[PDB]
From a paper:
The hypothetical protein NP_247299.1 is the gene product of locus MJ0327 in the genomic sequence of the Methanococcus jannaschii genome. Its function is unknown, but on the basis of sequence similarity the NP_247299.1 protein has been assigned to the dinitrogenase iron–molybdenum cofactor family (PF02579). The fold topology of NP_247299.1 resembles a ribonuclease H-like motif, with a three-layer α/β/α architecture.
The crystal structure was determined to 1.7 Å resolution at 100 K using a crystal obtained at 277 K from 100 mM Tris–HCl solution pH 7.0 containing 50%(w/v) PEG 200. The NMR structure of the protein NP_247299.1 in solution at 313 K has been determined and is compared with the X-ray crystal structure, which was also solved in the Joint Center for Structural Genomics (JCSG) at 100 K and at 1.7 Å resolution. The key message is that the two structures of NP_247299.1 determined with current JCSG methodology either in solution at 313 K for NMR data collection or in a single crystal at 100 K show very close coincidence both globally and in residue-by-residue com­parisons. Relatively high displacements are observed for residues 10–15, 30–34, 44–48 and 66–75 in the crystal structure and for residues 35–39, 42–46, 52–56 and 73–75 in the NMR structure. Along the polypeptide chain, high B-value-derived displacements are noted for four segments (residues 10–15, 30–34, 44–48 and 66–74). In particular, for residues 10–15, the electron density is unambiguous and does not show any evidence of the Asp11–Val12 peptide flip indicated by the NMR data. Residues 30–34 did show some minor differences between the initial REFMAC5 model and the rebuilt phenix.refine model, but again there was no indication that the backbone adopts multiple conformations. For residues 36–39, where the NMR data are interpreted as a ‘sliding β-bulge’, the maps are once again unambiguous, without any indication of multiple conformations of the backbone. While there is clear-cut NMR evidence for the presence of two local conformations formed by these six residues, we found no evidence for multiple conformations; the conformer with cis-Pro104 did not refine well and was pushed out of the density in each case. Moreover, the carboxy-terminus hydrogen bonds to Lys36 in the symmetry-related molecule and to two waters, which together appear to stabilize the trans conformation.
Author numbering: 1 to 104
The structure:
């Protein structure tokens, strides 16, 4: 069973085009294969520091920069979103059905 914290790169209406361009990071705690809680971290100068402090297990995004990939892939597994829908993607994540990004 998965017990993990996952960061998702979000626009107000959908998963964003990139980790870099998002409005906010949605921090989801998944426990006994269920979403238990959520939190918004705005993608501003402070939010960029905050996301590191969260110590997430995984990121879900559509695209990510070489720099951010280099930084986060040391510790964090980075998964590629499939379409725009965050709930569909959280489900796919839990099911083990998202692909792990190897190069941005």
């Amino acid at each position: 069973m998965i017990n993990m914290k996952v960061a998702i790169s979000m626009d107000v209406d959908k998963i964003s085009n990139s980790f870099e361009d998002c409005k906010y990071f949605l921090i989801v705690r998944i426990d006994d294969n269920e979403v238990k809680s959520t939190k918004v971290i705005f993608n501003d100068e402070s939010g960029k520091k905050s996301i590191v402090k969260e110590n997430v297990n995984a990121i879900i995004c559509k695209n990510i920069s070489e720099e951010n990939y280099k930084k986060f892939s040391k510790k964090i597994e980075i998964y590629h979103a499939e379409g725009d829908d965050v709930d569909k993607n959280i489900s796919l994540f839990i099911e083990g059905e998202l692909s792990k990004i190897s190069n941005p």
